[PDB]
Design a binder for this molecule. Sequence first.
Ligand SMILES: O=C(O)c1ccc(P(c2ccccc2)c2ccccc2)cc1
Ligand SMILES: [Au+]
Ligand SMILES: [Mg+2]
Ligand SMILES: [Mg+2]
Ligand SMILES: [Mg+2]
Ligand SMILES: [Mg+2]
Lengths: 106, 106, 95, 95, 82, 87, 98, 98
Amino acid sequence: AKTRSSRAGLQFPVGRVHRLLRKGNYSERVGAGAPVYLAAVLEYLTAEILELAGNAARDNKKTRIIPRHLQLAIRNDEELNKLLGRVTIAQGGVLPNIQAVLLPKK
Amino acid sequence: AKTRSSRAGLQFPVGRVHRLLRKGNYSERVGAGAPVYLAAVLEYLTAEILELAGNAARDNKKTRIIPRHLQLAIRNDEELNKLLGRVTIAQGGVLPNIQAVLLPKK
Amino acid sequence: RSRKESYSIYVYKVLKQVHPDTGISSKAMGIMNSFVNDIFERIAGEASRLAHYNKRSTITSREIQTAVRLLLPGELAKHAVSEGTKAVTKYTSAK
Amino acid sequence: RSRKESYSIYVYKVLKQVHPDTGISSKAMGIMNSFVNDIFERIAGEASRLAHYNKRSTITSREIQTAVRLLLPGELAKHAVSEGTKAVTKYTSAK
Amino acid sequence: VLRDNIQGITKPAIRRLARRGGVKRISGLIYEETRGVLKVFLENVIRDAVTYTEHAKRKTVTAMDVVYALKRQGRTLYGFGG
Amino acid sequence: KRHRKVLRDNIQGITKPAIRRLARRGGVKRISGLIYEETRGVLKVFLENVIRDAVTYTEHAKRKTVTAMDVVYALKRQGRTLYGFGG
Amino acid sequence: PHRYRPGTVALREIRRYQKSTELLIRKLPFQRLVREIAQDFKTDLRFQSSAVMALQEACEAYLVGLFEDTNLCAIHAKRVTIMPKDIQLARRIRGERA
Amino acid sequence: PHRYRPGTVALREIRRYQKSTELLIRKLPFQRLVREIAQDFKTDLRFQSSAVMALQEACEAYLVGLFEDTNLCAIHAKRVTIMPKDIQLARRIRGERA
DNA sequence: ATCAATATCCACCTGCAGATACTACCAAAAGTGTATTTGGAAACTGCTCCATCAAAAGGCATGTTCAGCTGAATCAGCTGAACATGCCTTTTGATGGAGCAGTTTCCAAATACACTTTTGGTAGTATCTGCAGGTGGATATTGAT
DNA sequence: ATCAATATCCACCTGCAGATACTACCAAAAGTGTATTTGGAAACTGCTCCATCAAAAGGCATGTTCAGCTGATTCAGCTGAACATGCCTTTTGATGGAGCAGTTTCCAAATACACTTTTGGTAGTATCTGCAGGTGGATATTGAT
Ligand SMILES: O=C(O)c1ccc(P(c2ccccc2)c2ccccc2)cc1
Ligand SMILES: [Au+]
Ligand SMILES: [Mg+2]
Ligand SMILES: [Mg+2]
Ligand SMILES: [Mg+2]
Ligand SMILES: [Mg+2]
């Protein structure tokens, strides 16, 4: 017995994704490729975020990813920020950003 | 043979609403009350809109409701306006509204 | 030539009830049709979600009712809920 | 007692491929779970609509692909599409 | 020394929120305006949350009830389930 | 057989007077001379985004013809639901 | 020779257009612009005429709405003249470019 | 002693609160307000601890965001001081009301 | 205020597009009537985790002082409104041709379903450690002079 | 400028809140073998969609003129920022019990399936009626004086 994940070359669970598609009332039927494709897409986006969040941890002299790092990764990347524009990361805070006109003159 | 609309007291089509609920993949099952309740809510809302639009028609000395009358009805009612706040009514135009500072004199 | 169905028939009946001497343009009817399809999907979608959240496989008038309280504002909800409760109560007692 | 499923096993496995010496807090992992479930729902939702608009009873990889194009910004979409197509190829070419 | 619950959202706490929002200087009328806005936000989200509670026949508002409420109000929150 | 003429610079068909008119409907009394190019740019972005989604639905359906329904669904996705053209 | 003062005809135009519902962009030019933009995404496309009309109704309703917001941004700045910075502020707060 | 000039500590707090992610409203008063408001919709309610926390994360992130747009509205009008009219304009353009 | 230019209003009036009216009408629904299956309400209760509260904690209410921001007032320059004038491009309405949406009928391939193995994934339990705060001392920033 | 006050940065240290690791079931994936279902591949329609040609008006482009708006400048007065601390509200941590969640049961209500009946959406022709767009002509509105 081989898993569909291992056949597809994936860490994300093809079988589970299939079931979650069946029992979510998305359609009467589900093609065999669909859970594979979907699982790979979700794995890909997960890798992308964990890549940039890891880097943000590294930059702050840390080996454990926290929500702050996820927030920094997401909001400093133009594409992830757009994808997640209507989403709040709990315990994320905001990007350091001060409007120019508020900086002291002399 | 009585229609389920006649049993329920309704101008709106209960059988049709039952069927659209089945084909839309909302759930495995549909209870018998569900399309009755939903067809009634739909009927209520359309009565509400037509009353107000009928009035806007009459106010503009007209007998035939056009899209402008629907827009005046919706936009002049706080609740319909909120329900439909992200909708565009084609050939609706806007409400007459001029910001005060833009009028002449003092 | 295939049957393209709409709510026109029923919108018109309801128009005649509220304003007996008032007509409606076909464009106005197009809008009224979009409005009913739109509100159907929103209520059905909230009901679907709500059932899933509670591990139910059945959408009943209780799911519709709650979806209506989530979707409609204040008075429209109240009145909508009354008309739907009353349509069911009547429907149930008529077989 | 009952099982409470999540994606955390898999997020952690992908974390190790991408940063082998980096760990993740519990809160961070909750956010990553929310992320997977959210994007799952958006893609599945769009795929469902796509099938319904084309009077099809089936969601295939073609609906997942079009949904990805509709939902992801440019570069993310391209790579997601290429990762998805690759996984379906590998899966088919595998006795 | 009795006090309104809304007033427990204090000038300095509203000021910290503003600061995280990058605000340098703050009119004295902001504190009451902000309390009004916060109350509306809580009303709208709590209403929907409780409506989920009542539907599940519960007497306890769950994190999930709040999460689903936030989602339909266009304020999706990651990290508390779902 | 026939071809198609090259389409270029058609954004300039959104003329200064058409933009004035739209502003009027929107309640605007006075209009800076820079508004017209800025509006053309905002309009182009908005059209590209809707057409992109509509054409994606067309291609998915394996048609060569963009239907009202494709536009309607693209507008809905974009949070700009339109009544009056089906659906 | 008779002249209305600056603002008088502008106010008349606001009343006139706010009263009516007709499309304000000329049809053929709008149709050419649609065809040009779509062609750059995909060659050899056709359009139902109602598709083009649906786009024009959407684009006009979006622009009118944007000018209302823009006008509020100008007035907030104690002006009566809309400027590119008003449109940009409206778009930023709307989350079109947030 | 020694006395910092107006704005110097304000800037300092901006830098400090933008670096961090702790909640900025005290928990008990928040929890009371939640329960009070909830009482109008249903009596004798209990709340999971995580339910109240999710609420406080959401309100604070919302209010911070709103203060950013509010600040943009103040700056648009050539001020550096936020006012009720800035908050009202930001809410209006967002579509949260009016 | 009074007067003259011109936009606005309103109401009556004929051509006609778009609306309502059948007619007939049939194909697809919707309804009716058993046969068959089961989702979830109902009732009992185990055990999280929630409200309450006592002692321990540390943030905020307060009133004064004055730095510097906001809003008022003034005004010179120049941008953007109004309008006259010349005419290009859109609108309207034909006509033909065909590219292509939209159906329908047969199957080969694909997906669901009932039944059995065979794990990967979770809860509960057991070790392991990253880093939140703490201190100590150097250095930068700010503001007074 | 120099010089003091105080904020800020960095290295190092260390206990334990919160990770990662391990174990051991077992629900749920995978394997197997039929039982439906579907999405085309071909093979035709009748659309609309595209193209194009001609006439005409209705709106567009442009240049001129100057009204009044914007943005610069100056300034006075008000209004929010900064400030030290003990009062008191919040935080922390310990303990009954409310009610969520686990589990089992069973029938009212759901799906399924094969008839029968009816309605809603067409399309063919027919009639009708509301109102768009044109006409004066009696009533404002605006701006010069
Ligand atoms: O999309 C934004 O985030 C955005 C932010 C600010 C502005 P305002 C602005 C005005 C003064 C200071 C800073 C900004 C602006 C833009 C262009 C020219 C002149 C003023 C516009 C957009
Ligand atoms: Au601005
Ligand atoms: Mg009536
Ligand atoms: Mg000047
Ligand atoms: Mg440290
Ligand atoms: Mg008329």
